[model samples]
Target chain A: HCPKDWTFFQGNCYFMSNSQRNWHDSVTACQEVRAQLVVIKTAEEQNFLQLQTSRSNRFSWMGLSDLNQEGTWQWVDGSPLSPSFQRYWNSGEPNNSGNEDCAEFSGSGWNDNRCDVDNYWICKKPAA
Target chain B: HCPKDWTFFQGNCYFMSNSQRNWHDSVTACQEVRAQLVVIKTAEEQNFLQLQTSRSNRFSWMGLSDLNQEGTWQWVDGSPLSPSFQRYWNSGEPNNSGNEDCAEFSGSGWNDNRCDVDNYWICKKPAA
Candidate 1:
């Protein structure tokens, strides 16, 4: 079951934040709620999020990042970035813009941004 | 087909505005782009808009209003509000607070706000 404020879809409970925080801070915030930064696995799941997201939440910190080693992305749960997975990157994105290492989901697509920049974030937990 | 910035969903194209305008001016702005203030007919359509809209656009002028006659809401395209239509009003809202006559879509749901208040708006056009 999902929390009253959380949205349920396909056995997962998703929470969209209204506050802004740095990537690492956002990660801690999700754990405080017993969740993790959202790990997008499929286009349908991404679309589900896109459909439920508000404009103010256009750019949100996600679970994926290259913080450990530049260009080597990994999910919060230790999943490696797969080349076969569906990706929705903006044109020429993840360009390591200004030492960008964190992933953010924007209105257009996924982007790499500086981790210290404050922004909204998505949290995902299993609907157990 | 949707314009470069417009988003496509089902058979319609949607546009979320970044600029602020009064309800009447918003209507005219949609017309200038060959669209109309969003006329929501289905929950799916509403969800689509909710997901794609940004935070700065939280309160957006839609096509619904009751200015013609108090308590008689109708769409801009001359469609009378049907009882069976899906509605997502905030609690105790549409109170007609402060001579509120225009309808605005918010993150929680739809609410009646002053028509003169400058706000962002949603526009809709058929994907021809």
Candidate 2:
């Protein structure tokens, strides 16, 4: 079992929040909760996150971003995303639309969005 | 695991929302999500519902209420309240404060409030 208000899957616990925060603040928000911004590594994990999530929802931020620079997306944990994970991006995404650097899931898959926009986020931590 | 945005605890799934609704509307809202207003059956569940819920959160409608028949409280699933469960109520509660008939989890514990006030709610369903 995971902490109360957290969902357990694989070896980790996932928590979703409806509260809004900028991407960087969301990172700190998870850290304050003893977790980290969620990092999706496989389609199974991606699908798990998307399951039962509103298809129209495009507000929850993920850990991926290129804020360290640009065109170099990396997970908040400093891991470079693999090609397999990159395929989860919505078609023609990471478009830097409005100088977007943060990632959020949508009705399609993932998309890059402005980091300053307040959005909901998912937090991940190891399960006991 | 429980549904995305839902928590897996013991053998059940619990979900919180920042959205607001009147008590009865919330019941249907949960049904739309395939659940019902959250029901707490024990101390562990009681404490779980209150932990890290939302900073400064004021309310979360519960399945417990006496609205159907002023003195007899019942859960959304049609279960009767146990005497043990009744002990969790906040001091001097169910006093029908202003003809209150709905139960909500407050910072202190259970508090019966007027059913028509829009407030946040928790939804509970079976875990997968």
Candidate 3:
């Protein structure tokens, strides 16, 4: 079975699907559950995130992409990129590897990559 | 399927929909699917939420409403009211209403109330 955990931030409970999927596939999975791929918004959130997880270099997916605009990133939640909270990327990030518009957490922070590759993913749901 | 747990606070797991839902419709929902509804701490968050959907005094919900002692409201995600959080009025705030039995954030800041009001809610999941 798929392993999972629920995270609470600013009074909201969310589940981080620790399963991988290409960006687009992850998004679809989240949508199927009435959720968006995960979106991180605060330091408290970042800190809260650290506790529930125990994996390293093991990349996970988040809701972000520059596919439409190509450079400016947007969260599936509709928020514009905030000042990088953890910024861990491999050299030459977002170069798009020829239109690799999707985003994932890698090397420690945000990295843009192709959307067809597989990786663990997350899903969100409405509580109120 | 009966009731549940799983909430994240400071990077942990939290699920508030404990099912009593007087103010607890709620705590249980968050726990069931690994989530907490709906917490409101800052005004910016309040605005981002207004767009997701709608409901009204029919009181759709959030992750708060005091129930601990009976006069303070705390979000199920584990946040003490930052000032007055959101002050509404049913005339009086958390009055225990009996032994009340739990802590819910309601009528704002931290009005301690009972844990049996069936209200809708929100949940949070990790992003990375």
Candidate 4:
């Protein structure tokens, strides 16, 4: 089962935030719910979030980044971003523009942004 | 509940076919189940189908086209493709190349293609 206010899908519980927070704080926010910024592993998961956040018109932080080593991205659990995983980066994205180390869902696709930027976030935990 | 092999999401039942068929035949195939080739109205729905068919690595016909009048696409139910609806077209697509009158899910985005071209399809009907 999923936690209160969270959605259940494919053995995972997902939560979408209603307010904005910096990437670090966003991770903390998910921690408050016993979750982490979402670690998207499949196209299905990406689609679920894309649908969930379509109306927000703002970025939603995902649990992915190259923060520790530029161009070497990983999920919150320290898993490397495998090539088998689907990536919906917008054209010419992840450009590391101005040290954009964190990843966010930008409505249409994924983008890298400064970790300090404010945006809504998604949290995910395993379902019982 | 959704039919045997169909997926349920947001009050609708979706079916993804593995075999290829022309756009017109695809529509007829959906009609067999009292559904229609998917009429995508939101980024969420597009993402849903996108995820469902991602692994097939082939085009899947969607119920969208400018068949009746060039540059004016509509759903099978004859509803106009409204601006509020999300469109995931590949760059410079729907160029109407060679009277491209139908739409298909072309991996990452939508593309206009000849209605007679064989491709897999997606179908949608209201969930019970």
**What global local distance difference test value does model 2 have?**
0.77
Q: Which pairs, if any, clash in model 2?
A: none
* TM-score to native of every candidate shown: 0.48, 0.48, 0.43, 0.49
Candidate RMSDs in Å, in order, are 20.3, 18.8, 17.8, 17.8
**Model 3 chain B weakest lDDT span, ten residues long:** B51-60
DockQ of each: 0.01, 0.01, 0.02, 0.01
Per-residue lDDT of candidate 2, residues B54-121 (tens digit): 35466888877675346667775545687878887888887897888778888767889887888899
Question: CAPRI band of model 1?
Answer: incorrect
Cα lDDT tens digits, model 1, A1-128, are 89998989898999998898999899889989988888776778888876556355568888877764566565665343544442677778879977998888877677899999998888998898
Better of 3 and 4 by DockQ: 3
* Residue A89 Cα positional deviation in candidate 1, in Å, after optimal superposition: 51
TM-score for chain B of each model, two decimals: 0.92, 0.91, 0.49, 0.92
Give me the candidate number with maximum DockQ: 3
Measured by lDDT, the strongest candidate is: 4
- Stretches off by above 4 angstroms in model 1 are A1-128, B54-57
Model 1 C-alpha RMSD vs. true structure (Å) is: 20.3
Query: Candidate 3 on B10-121: residue-level lDDT in tens?
Result: 4333333323344333444444454445665556555444433232222335555443223444554544556554443334644556644333333222333344455444
What DockQ would candidate 3 receive versus the native complex?
0.02
For model 1, the chain A TM-score is 0.92
Candidate 2 stretches greater than 4 Å from native:
A55-58, B1-128
